[PDB]
């Protein structure tokens with residue numbers, strides 16, 4: 213059975229990894245085993261002199277701080293964004309374009325980017341005068357918290373996986389992770405996409421294929437949009453995976469609407485289990501958010517994302533066909 | 538009481554640049570922030586306008602004042618009172634008459650009162666470099682300024698402390714957003730972009746048929762309030778010299794104590810923090826020339842000629858410090 217876990221991990225470099233099976237077979241440890249695998253595969257353990265036991269200790273503490281009773285924003289979603297970023301980092305149109313530290317940053321950021329998520333939105337936290345929104349002054353409330361927790365757990369006993377980075381590497385990695393995770397805030401999607409579009413029209417490439425990014429500002433924009441794409445990758449996965457993501461996000465939204473209802477609060481979009489339209493919402497979210505983003509990312513890495521974009525467009529067509537006339 | 542008669546006399550100056558804020562601190566039993574805020578709320582009729590019970594106001598003010606550190610030399614309750622009172626004067630400038638609502642006036646004054654609460658006496662960069670809990674909480678981004686906001690709003694929830702209890706929901710929400718926008722703008726790492734934006738507004742300035750500044754939209758209104766409180770924060774070099782000198786004594790002591798901690802730890806000592814390699818006079822001239830005067834000249838332009846005397850004092854003080862360079 214550990215034998216079967218080992219076999220599914222052999223797809224760690226493929227879009228559409230079997231992450232829910234990996235979660236079941238690993239004892240609800242998909243984040244730990246997928247991060248462990250990606251580090252071994254990318255050889256970051258010896259590139260950055262990380263004790264393997266310290267890696268595992270940190271990964272397990274981190275995974276423990278994802279909430280088991282949150283339907284979508286839990287450790288399976290984290291493991292899925294980690295493995296998804298890992299794939300997008302290997303696109304030929306970006307090969308060896310990022311340093312081993314820029315690679316460590318995007319993967320570490322992916323792993324911590326929703327840690328300790330309570331399963332309600334930033335707007336809910338603001339409207340209920342939550343401790344979180346009070347702490348963070350209503351600005352990227354959750355995303356600041358994910359960062360703070362993800363970095364704070366490094367200080368637990370035998371958890372500092374960056375202990376053998378130089379102090380300048382540590383400060384560079386820290387800034388990059390903060391910049392990336394703060395960019396997962398959906399209220400920053402449109403600016404982030406506008407920036408990605410600008411970068412596509414003025415794009416420059418070694419005509420032989422590989423992309424040419426010269427200054428940090430553009431390279432962090434690509435890592436921000438990359439982890440953002442990974443965060444928004446469910447509708448681009450094989451349909452049986454995507455449908456499971458949809459079930460969970462709707463269950464999580466519906467529980468938030470139940471909390472807004474007990475409180476007499478207005479019910480947020482897609483959180484009213486008595487007035488929902490699950491399929492129309494997915495088609496809508498694809499049309500206005502997910503496809504504009506992934507179309508621009510495919511232009512950026514042309515044609516390396518074509519097998520990702522086709523799947524997204526297949527999944528949009530299927531969902532639309534579940535809506536009667 | 539004799540001492541209260543004299544405190545009340547000094548508080549008659551609350552509308553004047555160069556109020557004796559240090560005397561008021563002494564005369565009020567180390568309550569300059571409480572007494573100056575209370576005086577200003579009475580002066581602007583804010584307790585009636587927003588139905589603020591006087592006992593609630595005093596209770597909040599005293600709790601807020603308590604959360605400034607009495608053992609920090611500059612970023613303490615006296616600084617807070619001074620910035621409140623300077624903002625109060627700047628709000629009353631003729632070029633801004635009837636521009637801002639009572640709620641905006643309330644926001645600017647409240648932001649000024651809380652804008653450094655629980656300041657530990659060390660810079661953002663120090664808190665980042667020492668991997669402090671604060672910098673870890675706030676991801677190295679406006680670390681202190683986020684903290685001042687969080688503490689200032691949290692204390693409103695203490696027993697009989699919610700001075701905004703009778704605002705409407707919409708009023709509370711708009712006040713909260715404006716205050717956040719203002720206090721985050723006190724982060725000195727935002728100064729250059731803030732001043733560059735203020736320059737643009739001066740260059741494209743619109744006035745009304747009455748000669749008063751015309752502000753069409755939130756973006757321009759909050760930008761003026763942001764720079765107003767930022768000017769009040771950077772107003773020490775514009776005050777009468779005997780006040781300015783005491784502010785300089787205090788910032789240097791607070792900077793020197795951070796430099797000792799930096800030296801204890803083998804860290805490079807931050808600018809102006811090395812008591813063995815300091816040039817107090819030259820640093821004040823440098824700070825005026827590169828930061829304070831560019832700001833105050835631009836603010837003076839925005840409200841021309843309302844602020845000419847403040848600018849003249851700033852330039853006199855600059856010349857005085859310059860004249861003392863050996």
Ligand SMILES: COc1c(O)cc2oc3cc4c(c(OCc5ccncc5)c3c(=O)c2c1CC=C(C)C)C=CC(C)(C)O4
Pocket residue numbers: 396397398399401443446447457458461481482493497
């Ligand atoms: C309220 O606006 C909508 C909206 O009307 C519909 C939305 O539908 C979603 C559908 C989703 C998911 C969504 O993402 C939640 C999310 C993602 C990233 N960061 C925060 C929240 C949204 C949405 O986030 C989503 C949003 C985005 C919110 C903003 C402020 C731009 C996640 C997974 C799948 C299965 C694709 O369905």
Ligand SMILES: COc1c(O)cc2oc3cc4c(c(OCc5ccncc5)c3c(=O)c2c1CC=C(C)C)C=CC(C)(C)O4
Pocket residue numbers: 723724725726728770773774784785788808809820824828
């Ligand atoms: C490191 O940069 C310097 C610097 O080299 C010199 C500086 O001199 C100051 C002198 C000061 C004060 C300073 O302000 C500290 C401050 C103010 C507002 N918010 C945060 C810090 C600085 C300074 O803030 C100051 C700074 C920091 C500001 C910027 C633009 C990054 C405060 C009071 C008086 C007496 C006018 O002397």
Ligand SMILES: [Mg+2]
Pocket residue numbers: 325326354396397
């Ligand atoms: Mg998130």
Ligand SMILES: [Mg+2]
Pocket residue numbers: 652653681723
């Ligand atoms: Mg400050």
Ligand SMILES: [Zn+2]
Pocket residue numbers: 289293325326396443
């Ligand atoms: Zn996420």
Ligand SMILES: [Zn+2]
Pocket residue numbers: 616620652653723770
């Ligand atoms: Zn200040």
